[PDB]
Amino acid sequence: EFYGPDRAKWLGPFSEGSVPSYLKGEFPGDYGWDTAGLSADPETFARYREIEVIHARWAMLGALGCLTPELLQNNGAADFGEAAVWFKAGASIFNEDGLNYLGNPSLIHAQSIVAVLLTQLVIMGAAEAYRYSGEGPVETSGDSLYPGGFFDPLGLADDPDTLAELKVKEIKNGRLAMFSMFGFFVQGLVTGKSPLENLADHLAEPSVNNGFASATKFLPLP
Amino acid sequence: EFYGPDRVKFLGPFSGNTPSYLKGEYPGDYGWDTAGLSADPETFARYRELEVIHARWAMLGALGCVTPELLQRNGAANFGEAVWFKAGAQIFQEGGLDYLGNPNLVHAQSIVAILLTQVVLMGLIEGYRVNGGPAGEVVDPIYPGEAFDPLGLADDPDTLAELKVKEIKNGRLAMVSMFGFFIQAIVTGKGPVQNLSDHLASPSTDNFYSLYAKTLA
Amino acid sequence: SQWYGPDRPKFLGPYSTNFVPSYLTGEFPGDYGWDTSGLSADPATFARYREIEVIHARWAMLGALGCVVPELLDGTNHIAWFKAGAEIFGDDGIQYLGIPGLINAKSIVATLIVQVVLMSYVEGYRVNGGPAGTGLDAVYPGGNFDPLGLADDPDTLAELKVKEIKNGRLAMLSMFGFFIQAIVTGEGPIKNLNDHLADASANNFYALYAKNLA
Amino acid sequence: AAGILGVLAGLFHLCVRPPQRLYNGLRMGNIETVLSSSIAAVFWAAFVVS
Amino acid sequence: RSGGAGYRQYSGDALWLPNTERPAWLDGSLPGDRGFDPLGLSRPAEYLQIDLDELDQNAAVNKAGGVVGAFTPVADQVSTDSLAPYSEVFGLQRFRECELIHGRWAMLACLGALVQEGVTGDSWVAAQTLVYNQPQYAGIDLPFDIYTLAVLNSVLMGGVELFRNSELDPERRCYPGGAFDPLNLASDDSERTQKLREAEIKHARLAMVSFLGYTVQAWYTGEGALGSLNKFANGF
Ligand code: CHL
Ligand code: CLA
Ligand SMILES: CC1=C[C@H](O)CC(C)(C)[C@H]1/C=C/C(C)=C/C=C/C(C)=C/C=C/C=C(C)/C=C/C=C(C)/C=C/C1=C(C)C[C@H](O)CC1(C)C
Ligand SMILES: CC1=C[C@H](O)CC(C)(C)[C@H]1/C=C/C(C)=C/C=C/C(C)=C/C=C/C=C(C)/C=C/C=C(C)/C=C/C1=C(C)C[C@H](O)CC1(C)C
Ligand SMILES: CC1=C[C@H](O)CC(C)(C)[C@H]1/C=C/C(C)=C\C=C\C(C)=C\C=C\C=C(C)\C=C\C=C(C)\C=C\C1=C(C)C[C@H](O)CC1(C)C
């Protein structure tokens, strides 16, 4: 279903002659989509595979992250004031009060932009450095892309049979995240509304409130 | 999952006592012959043909009883009577029955002509269905294929098996829902698209219990 | 023939005799050297890129012609290519040649549904064969796609392949011109040419656009 | 309208051979048959025109 | 590439019905042969010869003629007779020439009706009367009175059709070639010629049905080709 010659492919019934040789089904989510042929070199394929997975995991966090504040404040705590619409949430650190988590002044109450900058650079720098190094104090399992040695406390992946299917589940949920993250970006720029607000407009008038309603709002007027 | 002994059953977990003759050899076999109506293998075969035909007709009926109304509701067209249980009277109007509301379409003005044409056309193709005719010869009475599968979606045997279940399941759902269309028309007296809109507007008061209900008595 | 082999022309003309990628040997049409970035160093990537070029080209040639006709017809109101899609939202929707009754499309959802279904089959058939042809060359199928049997002589086919890619490459570059000119001028490509023909020195890119671009 | 049908009937009667049974029944090989039918047609027209 | 993915590559002879048999007289060699002849108009006709009725008034008894024999005349034989070149009316090759000539006229007519309606704005039916009263083309008034054009049309088409009838080879009557195939697209016996001829009958049959649509729509709606199209759209 997801490995071997009979695996599921991107073009479905017409994917028979679109499968690049080097793509054989030995890696998760190998639907055989390399029309341009960037993964012709095995080393470049190795690097691209890691980049895709890293992007997917970041996108998966981004998707949930970009919706949790707005969804909560739309019906719930309601503390997030105007910093709930992701794109327009960065200036939360520029609020006289401060970037208070869950709109709670006691929580974080950060106010220094340079501070969070340096902190993240140090926190992310070391972690990304360990990831590039291929070794660290934590268990590394030997696999940089899959260091479940310590990053897998629940041991949800103790047998290889599950790990395989689980790897496919990870990337496929990740791909949908990457695809949807690209959606958040474009919808933000084109509409200037939060992702749920765009969803609300579609539900109200699906025909009228679609992507083509804002098609002419980029026309290059003389 | 949908074939063989280790298949799914209509009674979920507590469905161990399934009839012997229902042993996962046909699409949609959930072991629901509680009345033993299909103990006879010959009667079971005929009932299977009856189920598929009733289902295929219902699927057309379900879609056809919504489109004329759904397009009218959205303002796409001006039908004579978009509601399915009043569309028949369109033939008695001054302008007859105009397809899509366009006078330059079918523009029928005679119910006798409609009936006579239907008897001859339905009579021939139904005879073709059971005996074979211009479209092809009969091999499987309910799964002819060939001319009736031009896209070749059932070319793969395994896919057809799976797709066979998909047809009867969408068909069975249509039969139930179309049965609902009949009852809701008799009770609500309003088209199913209208009835749906009402409930969705106020699912608390625009429900069958809040209205009608006791009225049926 | 002159377009194939080592004697083949080169993109730098005289200053390319000592500047030719080893992998480029003149065995494919439109081989003017170049490839200064080594993108097609991998033989597999070269084959994939070569197909994308001919595809992108055959599209650009359709696009280049298609972006001009509607702007060169009084019936279509000389509509600009970048301002044609909005016509679907017009009162009369899309009327081919500006003649009432033609198509009369008014729903952009219906057009996208038909385009997605029809183009998905067409592109799929181009990938793993189909009713038109099976086992034919990916970029040069022939048969149903060569009804007039123009390219039946291997020699003529070779020369015509160069003719296709060169007209196509010009169309690709000109289409990129159409894209940018539209974003800068804001008017149709034919309108731009008319202006440059009227007052060439007065109506150019630098006379009324370069300064406002920063 | 009679002219249009007269042309089309002339085309038919120019292409399709008479039936064998009708040819013998009406004696189509005998020109006196044409005289009998023409006399019949001309007195039909005389009654109408009167 | 293969395929067999989005289509069912069933093997058979494309006929006008999903399952049926070609008539014995419809082999399938001719372009566009779909085994369509339910009335058997191209079936080789059988005729009986009756003897000459006795009409001698010098004889005591004048018995009418009787069947002198049954003969099946050979069809598709062109002769030097200008008025009746073919041996039999009901021949496959004569009908194919009729099908092609009727079809080629319809192709010009179907395009001609559309173009003049989109150029002049006048219905093709109303076009006939307008040109009759004021000879004109593309809005330009022609320099010839209608009386001369009437004679010229009959004389020009008379010569043109008399030239056409000179040909004796039945296949060349349907496909003259020569000056009428300057590009030599389908002058050889290749498969491309067969495919091109298959395209021609399809476009020809389409145009024959299409122009039959024009006349009936003009009879019923009262509008022309483009006009009927506009009427239908507004009808909604
Ligand atoms: C290559 C395909 C393609 C391209 C380049 C465009 C381009 C455009 N469409 Mg469009 N469309 C295309 C396909 C399709 N459109 C539509 C339906 C519509 C509608 C309904 C509308 C448009 C409109 C527009 C214009 C947006 C307003 C404007 O002037 O912005 C300025 C933009 C530019 C000057 C050019 C921007 C393009 C950039 C240079 C890159 C071009 C290549 C891209 C990779 C695009 C790839 C497309 C596919 C493969 C994903 C714009 C020029 C709008 C319009 O014309 O209103 C005035 C509009 O209302 N399109 C359909 C479905 C029927 C398409 C199907 O393929
Ligand atoms: C990939 C290339 C490409 C693409 C994406 C487009 C896309 C588009 N073209 Mg275009 N075009 C192209 C290439 C392309 N074209 C080329 C190469 C040419 C030169 C032949 C043209 C010439 C052209 C014209 C003249 C027009 C368009 C128009 C359009 C727009 C609407 C298309 C339509 O009406 O529906 C689809 C079209 C068809 C399905 C063709 C069917 C034609 C009908 C059925 C019959 C033709 C009319 C007939 C001759 C009229 C009869 C009477 C007459 C003889 C007087 C659309 C955005 C129209 C427009 O209004 O722009 C906004 C328009 O008028 N194109
Ligand atoms: C299995 C079992 C077993 C055990 O043992 C016992 C028991 C339980 C008994 C069993 C069960 C059974 C069942 C359930 C049954 C059901 C049935 C149905 C409901 C059907 C429907 C059925 C239904 C159907 C067909 C439907 C149809 C419809 C149609 C055609 C339609 C038509 C139309 C249209 C479109 C529209 C218009 O306007 C009108 C009209 C014209 C009218
Ligand atoms: C060789 C080399 C080598 C080294 O190594 C590196 C380097 C340098 C990088 C390289 C280079 C490259 C290049 C130059 C590229 C370019 C490209 C392009 C521009 C394309 C286009 C491309 C383009 C294209 C396709 C286009 C297309 C178009 C189209 C379809 C159109 C459509 C349309 C029409 C008709 C009209 C309407 O109204 C609108 C529309 C709808 C819109
Ligand atoms: C096919 C293949 C092969 C051939 O050969 C060629 C080609 C074509 C090249 C290829 C393709 C590819 C594709 C298709 C695609 C890509 C995509 C993407 C979109 C990614 C993303 C990706 C994406 C991503 C990562 C994203 C991420 C995001 C994030 C983290 C976010 C964050 C945040 C939050 C939470 C919230 C706040 O308020 C803000 C922030 C702080 C900002």
Short mmCIF file of N, CA, C and O in Angstrom, two decimals, chain B residues 132-190:
data_model
loop_
_atom_site.label_atom_id
_atom_site.label_comp_id
_atom_site.label_asym_id
_atom_site.label_seq_id
_atom_site.Cartn_x
_atom_site.Cartn_y
_atom_site.Cartn_z
N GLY B 132 -31.19 -9.33 -23.40
CA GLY B 132 -30.17 -8.85 -24.29
C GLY B 132 -30.77 -8.19 -25.52
O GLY B 132 -31.88 -8.50 -25.96
N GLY B 133 -30.01 -7.26 -26.09
CA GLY B 133 -30.46 -6.52 -27.24
C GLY B 133 -29.35 -5.73 -27.89
O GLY B 133 -28.20 -6.18 -27.96
N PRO B 134 -29.68 -4.54 -28.37
CA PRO B 134 -28.67 -3.73 -29.08
C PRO B 134 -27.45 -3.39 -28.25
O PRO B 134 -26.34 -3.38 -28.79
N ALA B 135 -27.61 -3.13 -26.95
CA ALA B 135 -26.47 -2.70 -26.15
C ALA B 135 -25.55 -3.87 -25.82
O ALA B 135 -24.36 -3.67 -25.56
N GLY B 136 -26.08 -5.08 -25.80
CA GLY B 136 -25.23 -6.23 -25.58
C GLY B 136 -26.03 -7.43 -25.14
O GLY B 136 -27.23 -7.35 -24.89
N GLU B 137 -25.33 -8.56 -25.07
CA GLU B 137 -25.93 -9.80 -24.62
C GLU B 137 -25.85 -9.91 -23.10
O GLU B 137 -25.03 -9.26 -22.44
N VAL B 138 -26.71 -10.76 -22.54
CA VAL B 138 -26.80 -10.92 -21.09
C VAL B 138 -25.84 -12.03 -20.67
O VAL B 138 -25.90 -13.15 -21.19
N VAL B 139 -24.95 -11.72 -19.74
CA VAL B 139 -24.12 -12.72 -19.08
C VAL B 139 -24.41 -12.64 -17.59
O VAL B 139 -24.88 -13.61 -16.98
N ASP B 140 -24.14 -11.48 -16.99
CA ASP B 140 -24.52 -11.22 -15.61
C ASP B 140 -25.76 -10.34 -15.63
O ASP B 140 -25.69 -9.21 -16.16
N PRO B 141 -26.90 -10.79 -15.11
CA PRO B 141 -28.14 -10.01 -15.26
C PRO B 141 -28.08 -8.61 -14.67
O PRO B 141 -28.80 -7.72 -15.14
N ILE B 142 -27.26 -8.39 -13.65
CA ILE B 142 -27.19 -7.08 -13.00
C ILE B 142 -25.84 -6.40 -13.17
O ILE B 142 -25.72 -5.21 -12.84
N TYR B 143 -24.83 -7.10 -13.69
CA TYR B 143 -23.51 -6.52 -13.92
C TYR B 143 -23.07 -6.81 -15.34
O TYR B 143 -22.14 -7.58 -15.58
N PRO B 144 -23.72 -6.18 -16.33
CA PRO B 144 -23.37 -6.49 -17.72
C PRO B 144 -22.01 -5.96 -18.13
O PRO B 144 -21.23 -6.69 -18.76
N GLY B 145 -21.69 -4.72 -17.77
CA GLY B 145 -20.41 -4.18 -18.19
C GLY B 145 -20.36 -3.97 -19.69
O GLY B 145 -21.36 -3.70 -20.35
N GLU B 146 -19.15 -4.11 -20.23
CA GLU B 146 -18.89 -3.92 -21.65
C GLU B 146 -19.36 -2.55 -22.12
O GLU B 146 -18.72 -1.54 -21.85
N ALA B 147 -20.48 -2.52 -22.84
CA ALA B 147 -21.03 -1.25 -23.30
C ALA B 147 -21.45 -0.37 -22.12
O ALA B 147 -21.48 0.86 -22.23
N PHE B 148 -21.78 -0.99 -20.99
CA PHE B 148 -22.22 -0.25 -19.82
C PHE B 148 -21.10 0.06 -18.86
O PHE B 148 -21.35 0.61 -17.78
N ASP B 149 -19.86 -0.28 -19.21
CA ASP B 149 -18.68 0.16 -18.47
C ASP B 149 -17.66 0.72 -19.45
O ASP B 149 -16.55 0.18 -19.58
N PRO B 150 -18.00 1.79 -20.17
CA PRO B 150 -17.06 2.30 -21.18
C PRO B 150 -15.77 2.83 -20.59
O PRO B 150 -14.71 2.67 -21.21
N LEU B 151 -15.82 3.45 -19.42
CA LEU B 151 -14.61 3.95 -18.78
C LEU B 151 -13.71 2.83 -18.28
O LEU B 151 -12.54 3.09 -17.97
N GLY B 152 -14.22 1.60 -18.19
CA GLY B 152 -13.40 0.49 -17.72
C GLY B 152 -12.97 0.64 -16.28
O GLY B 152 -11.86 0.22 -15.93
N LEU B 153 -13.84 1.23 -15.46
CA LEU B 153 -13.52 1.42 -14.02
C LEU B 153 -13.57 0.06 -13.32
O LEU B 153 -12.96 -0.07 -12.24
N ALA B 154 -14.26 -0.92 -13.92
CA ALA B 154 -14.39 -2.26 -13.30
C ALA B 154 -13.47 -3.25 -14.01
O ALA B 154 -13.62 -4.47 -13.79
N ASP B 155 -12.54 -2.75 -14.84
CA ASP B 155 -11.64 -3.65 -15.60
C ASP B 155 -10.88 -4.55 -14.63
O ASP B 155 -10.86 -5.78 -14.85
N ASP B 156 -10.29 -3.96 -13.58
CA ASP B 156 -9.55 -4.76 -12.57
C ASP B 156 -10.56 -5.56 -11.74
O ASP B 156 -11.49 -4.95 -11.19
N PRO B 157 -10.41 -6.90 -11.63
CA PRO B 157 -11.37 -7.72 -10.91
C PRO B 157 -11.46 -7.31 -9.43
O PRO B 157 -12.56 -7.16 -8.93
N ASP B 158 -10.31 -7.11 -8.79
CA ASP B 158 -10.28 -6.73 -7.35
C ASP B 158 -11.02 -5.40 -7.17
O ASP B 158 -11.81 -5.30 -6.21
N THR B 159 -10.76 -4.44 -8.05
CA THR B 159 -11.41 -3.10 -7.93
C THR B 159 -12.92 -3.27 -8.07
O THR B 159 -13.65 -2.65 -7.27
N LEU B 160 -13.36 -4.08 -9.03
CA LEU B 160 -14.82 -4.29 -9.24
C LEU B 160 -15.42 -4.84 -7.95
O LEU B 160 -16.44 -4.29 -7.50
N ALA B 161 -14.80 -5.87 -7.37
CA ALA B 161 -15.29 -6.44 -6.10
C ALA B 161 -15.52 -5.30 -5.11
O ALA B 161 -16.64 -5.19 -4.58
N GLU B 162 -14.49 -4.48 -4.87
CA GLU B 162 -14.62 -3.35 -3.95
C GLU B 162 -15.68 -2.37 -4.43
O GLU B 162 -16.50 -1.89 -3.65
N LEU B 163 -15.67 -2.06 -5.73
CA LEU B 163 -16.63 -1.10 -6.27
C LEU B 163 -18.05 -1.65 -6.23
O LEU B 163 -19.02 -0.88 -6.18
N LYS B 164 -18.20 -2.98 -6.26
CA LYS B 164 -19.52 -3.58 -6.12
C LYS B 164 -20.14 -3.23 -4.77
O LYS B 164 -21.33 -2.93 -4.69
N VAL B 165 -19.33 -3.28 -3.71
CA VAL B 165 -19.82 -2.90 -2.39
C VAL B 165 -20.19 -1.42 -2.37
O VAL B 165 -21.22 -1.03 -1.81
N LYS B 166 -19.36 -0.59 -2.99
CA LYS B 166 -19.61 0.85 -2.99
C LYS B 166 -20.93 1.18 -3.67
O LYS B 166 -21.63 2.11 -3.26
N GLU B 167 -21.28 0.44 -4.72
CA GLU B 167 -22.53 0.71 -5.42
C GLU B 167 -23.74 0.38 -4.56
O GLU B 167 -24.67 1.18 -4.44
N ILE B 168 -23.74 -0.81 -3.95
CA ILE B 168 -24.91 -1.22 -3.17
C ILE B 168 -25.03 -0.37 -1.91
O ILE B 168 -26.14 -0.07 -1.46
N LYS B 169 -23.90 0.04 -1.33
CA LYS B 169 -23.96 0.85 -0.12
C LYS B 169 -24.48 2.25 -0.41
O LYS B 169 -25.35 2.76 0.31
N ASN B 170 -23.97 2.89 -1.46
CA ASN B 170 -24.58 4.15 -1.90
C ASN B 170 -26.02 3.92 -2.33
O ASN B 170 -26.89 4.77 -2.13
N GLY B 171 -26.30 2.76 -2.94
CA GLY B 171 -27.66 2.45 -3.33
C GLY B 171 -28.58 2.23 -2.15
O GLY B 171 -29.71 2.73 -2.13
N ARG B 172 -28.13 1.48 -1.15
CA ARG B 172 -28.95 1.24 0.03
C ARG B 172 -29.25 2.54 0.76
O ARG B 172 -30.38 2.77 1.21
N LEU B 173 -28.24 3.41 0.88
CA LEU B 173 -28.45 4.71 1.50
C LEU B 173 -29.48 5.52 0.72
O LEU B 173 -30.32 6.21 1.31
N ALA B 174 -29.43 5.44 -0.61
CA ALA B 174 -30.39 6.15 -1.43
C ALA B 174 -31.80 5.61 -1.23
O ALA B 174 -32.76 6.38 -1.18
N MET B 175 -31.94 4.29 -1.12
CA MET B 175 -33.26 3.71 -0.91
C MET B 175 -33.88 4.19 0.39
O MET B 175 -35.07 4.52 0.44
N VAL B 176 -33.09 4.24 1.46
CA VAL B 176 -33.60 4.73 2.74
C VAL B 176 -33.97 6.20 2.63
O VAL B 176 -35.07 6.62 3.01
N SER B 177 -33.05 7.01 2.09
CA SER B 177 -33.28 8.44 2.00
C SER B 177 -34.45 8.75 1.07
O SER B 177 -35.25 9.65 1.34
N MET B 178 -34.55 8.02 -0.04
CA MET B 178 -35.68 8.22 -0.94
C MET B 178 -36.98 7.81 -0.27
O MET B 178 -38.02 8.44 -0.49
N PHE B 179 -36.94 6.75 0.53
CA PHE B 179 -38.09 6.40 1.35
C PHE B 179 -38.44 7.54 2.30
O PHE B 179 -39.62 7.80 2.57
N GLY B 180 -37.42 8.22 2.81
CA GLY B 180 -37.67 9.41 3.62
C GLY B 180 -38.35 10.50 2.83
O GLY B 180 -39.26 11.17 3.32
N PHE B 181 -37.93 10.70 1.58
CA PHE B 181 -38.53 11.72 0.73
C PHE B 181 -40.04 11.51 0.62
O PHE B 181 -40.81 12.47 0.66
N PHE B 182 -40.46 10.26 0.47
CA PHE B 182 -41.89 9.97 0.39
C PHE B 182 -42.61 10.38 1.67
O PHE B 182 -43.62 11.09 1.63
N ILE B 183 -42.09 9.96 2.82
CA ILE B 183 -42.77 10.20 4.08
C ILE B 183 -42.74 11.68 4.43
O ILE B 183 -43.75 12.26 4.85
N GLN B 184 -41.58 12.32 4.24
CA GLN B 184 -41.47 13.74 4.56
C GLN B 184 -42.40 14.58 3.69
O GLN B 184 -42.97 15.57 4.15
N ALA B 185 -42.58 14.19 2.43
CA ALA B 185 -43.53 14.88 1.57
C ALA B 185 -44.95 14.74 2.11
O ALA B 185 -45.70 15.71 2.16
N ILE B 186 -45.30 13.52 2.52
CA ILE B 186 -46.68 13.25 3.03
C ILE B 186 -46.89 14.05 4.32
O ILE B 186 -48.00 14.57 4.52
N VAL B 187 -45.85 14.15 5.16
CA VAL B 187 -45.99 14.85 6.47
C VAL B 187 -45.70 16.34 6.29
O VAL B 187 -46.64 17.14 6.42
N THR B 188 -44.45 16.69 6.00
CA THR B 188 -44.06 18.13 5.90
C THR B 188 -44.84 18.80 4.76
O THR B 188 -45.21 19.97 4.92
N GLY B 189 -45.06 18.08 3.66
CA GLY B 189 -45.73 18.70 2.49
C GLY B 189 -44.80 19.66 1.79
O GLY B 189 -45.28 20.44 0.95
N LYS B 190 -43.51 19.61 2.12
CA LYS B 190 -42.51 20.52 1.51
C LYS B 190 -41.36 19.68 0.94
O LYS B 190 -41.10 18.59 1.49
#
